[PDB]
Amino acid sequence: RYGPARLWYDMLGVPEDDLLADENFLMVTQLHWEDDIIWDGEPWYSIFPIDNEDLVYGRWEDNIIWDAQAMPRLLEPPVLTLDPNDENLIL
Amino acid sequence: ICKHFSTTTNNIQSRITKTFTKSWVDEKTPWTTRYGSIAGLAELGHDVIKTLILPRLQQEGERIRSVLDGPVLSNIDRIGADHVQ
Amino acid sequence: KLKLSNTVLPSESMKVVAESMGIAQIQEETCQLLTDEVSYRIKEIAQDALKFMHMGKRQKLTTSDIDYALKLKNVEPLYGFHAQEFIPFRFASGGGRELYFYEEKEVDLSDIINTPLPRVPLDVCLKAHWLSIEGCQPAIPENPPRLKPRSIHELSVEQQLYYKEITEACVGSCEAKRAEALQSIATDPGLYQMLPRFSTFISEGVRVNVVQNNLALLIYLMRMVKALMDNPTLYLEKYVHELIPAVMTCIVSRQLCLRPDVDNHWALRDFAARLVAQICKHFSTTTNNIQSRITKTFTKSWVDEKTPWTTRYGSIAGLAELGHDVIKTLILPRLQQEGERIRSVLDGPVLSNIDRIGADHVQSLLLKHCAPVLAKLRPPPDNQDAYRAEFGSLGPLLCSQVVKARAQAALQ
Amino acid sequence: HELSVEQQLYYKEITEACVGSCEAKRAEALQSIATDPGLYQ
Amino acid sequence: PHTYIKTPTYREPVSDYQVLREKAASQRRDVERALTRFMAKTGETQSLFKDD
């Protein structure tokens, strides 16, 4: 309740505490890659960066609210997790 | 957000197009959410509306079923339907 | 549930055999008596030829299994003939008769002599490999297949070191290093799940490698693309949206480095790029997305007025290597424009630019394509001055190229 | 892990400027969010 | 041993006191500059120079 989004919590007043075929979606068939063609232009620690595991793996699509009244599951308040994989954060 | 951040490890754009597509092709969806699906799919680009929107252009007939000839005119489906149109 | 039946040979085939032998007027009970006896002997032998299949450790009944199953039942394996005396061939298999249902039933006796004999295959050798290393099966080609936690990269450090070695070998400092790294790309089965980083390294490389036209850097990257394509294990059409604009840029771009001299390689940079471009339109094909898109870009590269001649030559090569019908339907209505461009380069004295070299290469390539396009759809009559109706570009030399093609066809 | 008072005050002012009391403070808060260098953390 | 064995890697950690002091200092200076410019722009303001 007191974390980020406390303003929303206080305003609410809660106080406890065939077109679906895989090819259609391949980005060769969905991207104007012609624009890229350049015409007359003018490891002990990781070598590559580490991607957001939640974006790469998690089903964030399950947080889309398709119908406000008929919501298939019950959502819960989210706690701040302060991922330390991201640089630019002191801790 | 899927032009700046979609990478082949991310699969942001393909997973956004798949949600929009199975929300649009599936019937029982309201005209507001179909409007949102068509709006996102049509803001993605030209090849997306070539290979997603243009097969279901016959759905416009199913739309004009409820526009040119509706038993209930004073409902809220007509403004959303001709906005979709 | 088992509805097993007893299938016998038809009796209406046994009366045909009997009346074609001199035994006429046979009864049906006489004829049914023949087709349950011989259908048992076929069933007795095929059950007995399945013993030799299992003993030889095969799952396919070969033609030699019935030769040993017949010899086991004291019947001669000979099928074409039967020797009453049995002394010339005693239970010796002659390998059956190579006969067909759709055969010609008459051949010329010098057709069998003049055909080349098939190549005797390699003899049996013993190679050893590893199925299991202390419990784990290796991926060698002889084998078939609140703070959030600190995440790990999806590559191992052996895999990341392998990627670093393969990429530092594929920039071609040493040629043997390149060639192995290219073969390693061409047949590593576990090269999936590293393929985003290879595609990104290729794509990003060509775009910052055409800022200064570094031909080797590009020839090595195109060979890396070709080595990525012929690998059978990896799934490529998720990454072809990065691969294709890289090759189009090799073919349709201007050369920032010395214009002449390496233009010979530049033609090959456009030769390797047009090869991999038509190989990419051969694979990965769905309706009206890939091949038609690169065809449209090549044609609007061609019909564009007052092009760079490097871009012109590359696009000409790219449209040229697209197959049989593409030059049959596209290069036809454009000969006059090609001739006019050649005439302009010829008239203007300017020789220190690259326009003249570009013109000569374009004309030679167009003339060779036009030669078979002609050899392919017409007879070789009037090969002297009829080509003067097509502005007289290749003429008798085109006719000589067509004659060389005809000689190659005769050799085939 | 816990924001210092400076950035706690900055977070409070920027979030309460985008709730709808007036439009000009909202436009300056959005022009702050879009054009500041150190808003990580 | 790309074929039978494997091991994980991590991201490069920056445990340097100099660059950590620099990062915390510059982030504190930038957030206090952003806060004071936002509060001076959305209120009554003074200026040492004419129309500044």
From Swiss-Prot, chain A:
Subcellular localization: Nucleus
PTM entry text: Phosphorylated by casein kinase II in vitro.
Resulting phenotype, residue 52 to D: Found in a patient with X-linked intellectual disability; uncertain significance
Entry's family note: Belongs to the TAF1 family.
Functional description taken from the UniProt entry: The TFIID basal transcription factor complex plays a major role in the initiation of RNA polymerase II (Pol II)-dependent transcription. TFIID recognizes and binds promoters with or without a TATA box via its subunit TBP, a TATA-box-binding protein, and promotes assembly of the pre-initiation complex (PIC). The TFIID complex consists of TBP and TBP-associated factors (TAFs), including TAF1, TAF2, TAF3, TAF4, TAF5, TAF6, TAF7, TAF8, TAF9, TAF10, TAF11, TAF12 and TAF13. TAF1 is the largest component and core scaffold of the TFIID complex, involved in nucleating complex assembly.
Assembly and oligomerization: Component of the TFIID basal transcription factor complex, composed of TATA-box-binding protein TBP, and a number of TBP-associated factors (TAFs), including TAF1, TAF2, TAF3, TAF4, TAF5, TAF6, TAF7, TAF8, TAF9, TAF10, TAF11, TAF12 and TAF13. Interacts with TAF7; the interaction is direct. TAF1, when part of the TFIID complex, interacts with C-terminus of TP53. (Microbial infection) Interacts with SV40 Large T antigen.
Associated disorder: Dystonia 3, torsion, X-linked: An X-linked dystonia-parkinsonism disorder. Dystonia is defined by the presence of sustained involuntary muscle contractions, often leading to abnormal postures. DYT3 is characterized by severe progressive torsion dystonia followed by parkinsonism. It has a well-defined pathology of extensive neuronal loss and mosaic gliosis in the striatum (caudate nucleus and putamen) which appears to resemble that in Huntington disease.
Gene behind this protein: TAF1
Curated annotation (Swiss-Prot), chain D:
Disease in which the protein is involved: Alazami-Yuan syndrome: An autosomal recessive syndrome reminiscent of Cornelia de Lange syndrome and characterized by delayed psychomotor development with intellectual disability, hypotonia, microcephaly, short stature, poor speech, and dysmorphic features.
Family per record: Belongs to the TAF6 family.
Function: The TFIID basal transcription factor complex plays a major role in the initiation of RNA polymerase II (Pol II)-dependent transcription. TFIID recognizes and binds promoters with or without a TATA box via its subunit TBP, a TATA-box-binding protein, and promotes assembly of the pre-initiation complex (PIC). The TFIID complex consists of TBP and TBP-associated factors (TAFs), including TAF1, TAF2, TAF3, TAF4, TAF5, TAF6, TAF7, TAF8, TAF9, TAF10, TAF11, TAF12 and TAF13. The TFIID complex structure can be divided into 3 modules TFIID-A, TFIID-B, and TFIID-C.
Organism: Homo sapiens
Range of the intact protein held here: 214 to 254 of 677
Description of how the protein assembles with itself and partners: Component of the TFIID basal transcription factor complex, composed of TATA-box-binding protein TBP, and a number of TBP-associated factors (TAFs), including TAF1, TAF2, TAF3, TAF4, TAF5, TAF6, TAF7, TAF8, TAF9, TAF10, TAF11, TAF12 and TAF13. Interacts directly with TBP, TAF1/TAFII250, TAF9/TAFII31 and TAF12/TAFII20. The TAF6/TAFII70-TAF9/TAFII31 heterodimer forms an octamer complex with the TAF4B/TFII105-TAF12/TFIID20 heterodimer.
Phosphotyrosine modifications at: 40
Gene name as annotated: TAF6
Sites bearing Phosphothreonine, chain numbering: 35
Localization of this protein: Nucleus
Protein name from the UniProt record: Transcription initiation factor TFIID subunit 6
Domain of life of the native organism: Eukaryota
UniProtKB/Swiss-Prot annotation, chain E:
Localization per Swiss-Prot or TrEMBL: Nucleus; Cytoplasm
Disulphide-bridged cysteine pairs: none
Source superkingdom: Eukaryota
Inducing stimuli: Induced with triglyceride accumulation.
Coiled-coil intervals, chain numbering: none
Other remarks on this protein: 'Taube nuss' means 'empty nut' in German.
Subunit structure: Component of the TFIID basal transcription factor complex, composed of TATA-box-binding protein TBP, and a number of TBP-associated factors (TAFs), including TAF1, TAF2, TAF3, TAF4, TAF5, TAF6, TAF7, TAF8, TAF9, TAF10, TAF11, TAF12 and TAF13. Interacts with TBP, TAF1, TAF6, TAF10, TAF11 and TAF13. Component also of a small TAF complex (SMAT) containing TAF8, TAF10 and SUPT7L. Forms a heterodimer with TAF10. Interaction with TAF10 is mediated mainly via its histone fold domain while interaction with SUPT7L is via its C-terminal region.
Family: Belongs to the TAF8 family.
Involvement in disorder: Neurodevelopmental disorder with severe motor impairment, absent language, cerebral hypomyelination, and brain atrophy: An autosomal recessive disorder with onset soon after birth or in early infancy. Affected individuals do not show developmental progress, are unable to sit or walk, do not acquire speech, have poor visual fixation, and show poor overall growth associated with feeding problems. Additional variable features include seizures, spasticity, and joint contractures. Brain imaging shows hypomyelination, thin corpus callosum, and cerebral and cerebellar atrophy.
Domain comment quoted from the record: Ectopic expression of the histone fold domain acts as a dominant-negative mutant resulting in differentiation inhibition.
Full protein name: Transcription initiation factor TFIID subunit 8
